[PDB]
């Protein structure tokens, strides 16, 4: 049952003509705002956002409380309060501390909603319930129905981030296994998930994965459909293994089968499968109500059974053998923390999220030193090498194209069947190397097209301080083939690659590309299509996660009004305010 | 809408006949629970309590999730989880912080439900979401359908209290005027109502009340119905005023009219009146969505107009000219902290609450000196005089008799109109003394019957500590008329009276009657009928208000299990645990 | 390298003869202490305790600085300062915050040790580093070298506990699996182990155990030995499974084989096995450096592979197919918190530890109702069924016997091989009930001999409060054969049983037997032989873990001096002391 947005039309309660004068414009402003969001935006799942409107305009507590009754029955997880006139501050505001809120005041003189806004905001900050401000840059006339650029931008950025918050609430992270090679992020912090995101964590031991394959706790016909799809579509790459370690044709397909079964069995665990009920396996059918998940893999799975690379790549992809669909969020090396970043990215943009190891920083001096060539253009100042250990969403090739014909990544509802297969055609599946993946496996190798805007994000936990976010907006570069193959042969050529250059501000961590990587707080990161830092920043305020690091333009910063009271400085305000309000849910 | 109780039947997840073998009993047990609550309990307003059972038994996150969706659209604000078997702990618990919750495990051996209870509870306190334990004293045979008596007490005590938490949530306290005569409780701490109770505060200047009377903003037909009704029933008391400050009948009619108007205009303010819409006054029709109020009175109102003595009495009573109805909660002198006690007591009992000033402690030495005869029986160790400034719930006369035919106060739905008139028959209406109340008034004078159990409660705000709760289970007593008459003349004989004897423990404040007076945290207190200390204590723990003074036996103290982990000592664990979890809402 | 005990003799600084008088006495008293300790105490593993003395006698900063670097060199985890004279306080105290320290002032008149003790403690508590205080009631003459009874208890109790804290520092807890059946204790909290105990947690997925048994990563020679032993010594009980679920003998051989192979494999993982390195399995030969360990089992392993009933039971015993050894600590269901109470139990007593489900409380009324008979003697007031879900240290049969020939448990170095076979011939190996344990297994069933004194303990984590300790001293009982069989039948007759009865104080949780269970913090607990509540209380205090529940007479309560400054109440002092000082390690 999807969350909804609740519009609260708010009004001057005084009569003898004043209320009746204002009613129509007020409710129409409400309607306007439903209209704007519902057409402009979608859930990440794909569905149409349903906005709920109060039965009458609110001018005080009786009317205000009817709305709450109407909203609770209707699962509203966000609200916007809209008005063109002055109304009675604290009597009319929304006091539920759990939901993100925003106040839109019509910037006018004849209709001075802007005035009420600043007062209703001051009530919010005084009662410890922060709210966002929507304030038009230019005074409009009282007979105008248009919505300016700025207002619409905020209205939408707000709603984009509010629907993310409410979508996580009440849902599960599924931890298939636990700690992978002492990686911090795989030490799943149930209190972080419960207190900040409002999630439950379900832990499942990887023998549960094994059990499902063996005891035939999957859809047997789907396996054949999957394999059929696998055969027609999968272009294989070079085996790189030592000769005595190679696998014959029959062994190679048993690996492949298992790999596919793992993908299937994980999905069955995350979201359930009615077919297993029919098949009689009634217990296993319900799933763990999980919108994100991790798979440990190394060391203990991959030292005997096939690595999860295929399964991870297919589940993070927008498409598979059953057609196009909304991508899953499955973290490799069970990196619950990178999964959070993915899950936010997913819910903010509706697109596939590229899991990525932050492998190498290529210094301009260093690249001249081994390729003989110069880093040129976007890579002038240095390059960074994003390359996961055998898995990534296939959407990352960027064979998807926009309307202007440039390479990009897109929502699942915007994706035609031809673009699905085009992305497969960019993908060669190289066997895993047996010293590390003794059970075998297949990598998904691709190269992300150059010149794509990307947002590198990461969430870390810092003892004594809590969770923090890191952001680095940038671009993928496309190096000369001569240079590329030699840095690729240099690293791990079996694996998917992305060349990333980050926007520099010449300040602090973004002074030079070196320090960007040097101030990263983990070996992993998530790549989200686009420049979305401004949207990420707003979500981190809503969760009261401060941002230790970002290159987003100061003008673009959008947070609850309460934050500005915590200081003029954009960074300093964030730590005090986050400390103040603390986690949302407990 | 009214709040509902969610019942969560929880079950072992495994099949092969295991879940099957239990579904029946586990479902039957939720139904038995909802039935009992629904039969033996009512809302404070007299409505039937609905209960919502989960669609399926719960064994994991997915079923648990669907219970939540069901519960959210159904306005449930209390849960009880029931099981007769072991289940999967943290997967199956209710996670919402803002709801009171309980767990009831079947004390069986074939059915080891208490073994899940113990694990679930440990889960709760590890995850900072405390919950109540319901464990039956005696092992029960698997086929037994009956609910033990000790289990019934706990279930009901929990429901009774939980409903009160959920009833206050989102309602208003209407403060009519500001501070009265420097009384701390008249400084309305808006944050306390928000954070602790989940209510809001509406402030109305008393000029508004004047305005309604001036501009005839009230159902005019009602007024002559009121006035008619009083003329038929109101006894009158001697004018203890001076000769020059006495009033001719014409003047007296003016105050009584006004005294009865205030009752109606305050009531109309608190909840609203559709008649006012019908007469064109659509703004005033609505009300402030208020379940409690307070009226300032002195000095600024009582120095010109008639005091609220009469209004307050009738409003807090369980009947008026329109017959027997659920009482209101209006605080004399705008004592919002006496308001809260009144509110809490009323929600726990359904009955009317007696506002009292805590006027005199009469020593046994002191009584013998002024009357020549000693206090005897229940008054053996001292008496405390409880007498409010002119007002009190007429039901406080205790003219009502119960099933065994002895003095009491019943929930309004067990009040026959015949009894209603007996409480009016024992009340004499006496004029206000002019020097204090210049605008005059009438004061409901009655004498409470002896031997009636009472609990006396107060809430107080201690800066740097928060809200605290005082409780004192005791008896009202009858004194010999000669004795009573002397002590009434010294104090105020136009004012209603109750002679209170607190039950002693011989320890702390309850070592003697003097100490009970001397520790009481304010000049005002509240009388709830019967011995309801246990219910208050439970309610207090649900709201995380520590209890600082009580004479309830140690076995009766019922609180979440987490409390026990903060220490064996019932006073020590309470402060520490209350310090830990803090106010419920923010 | 085990920790050592550092003994500090301290002396009056001043020379000119007086110092020189005391030097002989001062260190003769320190050598007595080192002799007393190493005579009456041994390490839990069996080794003799090594007491390092300071090279000189300490009288100022200079000598005390030498003594530390010597003490750092020798691995002392505990210090005991002794003296028979005045010395210079702030100059002579051990200042290392991590080591648990005690000070032993001699009670003489010519030799004023008492005075030094108070000034030293005062300096300690003023400098934030609590220490214990040893003081004899009765005064002794300076020529007397014998050490009195009461000083002996305080020295032994201190060193016994300080060694516990010392032995756990830097060691690891091995988590074989993740969360078991949503049990809080099996959500291993890494930061608890680290901060409070100075331990690490190593997480291994249960698939790694699979690999070791499938790829023969074990000693195959021992395996045959084990099977041989198993055939010779194992008695079997009857199969209580359904017929269609009964295993034939070919299957029962494999199930047994793997159960035993689990034992061996889990051991290897904990401490290393060098036979493996010879065998070319060098990486698996090191192990994880573990002094406790949890095994998850349900649900994921037990739904396809044989359970750990047998393995757990054999590892936690004081003997196996290689004869008598220091028992291991393996927690069933990966309940790490029960593991911690086992670890503590073990370190303090050197015995085996019994892991229990706190399954049923049998009120007198209940036992009369069902058996027709009444409980009697120690069982007079109630009885609590302690029964683990398949596995328990076989020592728990209490077939081992003491000097007088009374039932008991002994540390592994006082257990005759004849005794171990006694313990084993009390057992019968019942096959696992198929529907809970699909994979099979063998549940070690015995009946604990009555009259034995026992201590039940538990550790819980409370959000906002941190860890806490539960203690209940009592005895096991022996009921009439007829009564036992009625009670056992309906419960779980294939599983090991212990009838426990807690000493009642009349107060709080120990007012009666119902309360004991009712306030118990989890489904699980640990049985440690005898009445060692006094020991756990002392170890808790060194560990800064409040004691929320205990029935130890307060005469025996022994904690650091600083505690006394936090109040007279033996409970309030504790919570305040623990919140002040908090975890030893970060
Ligand atoms: Mn990696
Ligand atoms: Mn008063
Ligand atoms: Mn158990």
Residue numbers in the entry:
A (entry chain B), B (entry chain D), C (entry chain A): 5 to 590
Publication text:
The enzymatic approach using l-fucose isomerase, which interconverts l-fucose and l-fuculose, can be an efficient way of producing l-fucose for industrial applications. Here, we performed biochemical and structural analyses of l-fucose isomerase identified from a novel species of Raoultella (RdFucI). The monomer RdFucI consists of 19 α-helices and 23 β-strands comprising N1, N2, and C domains. In the asymmetric unit, RdFucI subunits form the hexameric formation arranged as a dimer of trimers with D3h pseudosymmetry.
Thus, we speculated that the addition of Mn2+ to the RdFucI crystal would increase the binding occupancy of Mn2+. After soaking RdFucI crystals in a solution of 10 mM Mn2+, reliable Fo-Fc electron density (> 6σ) on the metal binding site was observed where the position of Mn2+ was clarified in all subunits. However, the temperature B-factor of the Mn2+ (76.56 Å2) was higher than that of the whole protein (60.69 Å2), implying that Mn2+ ion is still not fully occupied in the metal binding site. Mn2+ was coordinated by OE1 (average distance: 2.62 Å) and OE2 (2.65 Å) atoms of Glu337, OD1 (2.72 Å) and OD2 (2.72 Å) atoms of Asp361, NE2 (2.52 Å) atom of His528, and the water molecule (2.79 Å). The average bond angles of Glu337(OE1)–Mn2+–Asp361(OD2), Glu337(OE1)–Mn2+–His528(NE2), and Asp361(OD1)–Mn2+–His528(NE2) were 127.32°, 86.25°, and 73.96°, respectively. The bond angle between ligands and Mn2+ showed a distorted octahedral coordination. The structural analysis of RdFucI showed that apo RdFucI contains Mn2+ with a low occupancy in the active site, whereas the occupancy of Mn2+ in the active site of RdFucI was increased by the addition of Mn2+. In contrast, the activity of isomerase activity was increased by addition of Mn2+ because the occupancy of Mn2+ was increased in the active site through additional Mn2+, which served as a platform for more substrate binding for isomerase activity. Therefore, the binding affinity of Mn2+ is considered to be low because RdFucI does not stably coordinate the Mn2+ binding sites by the ligands. As a result, the addition of additional Mn2+ may increase the occupancy of this cation in the active site of RdFucI.
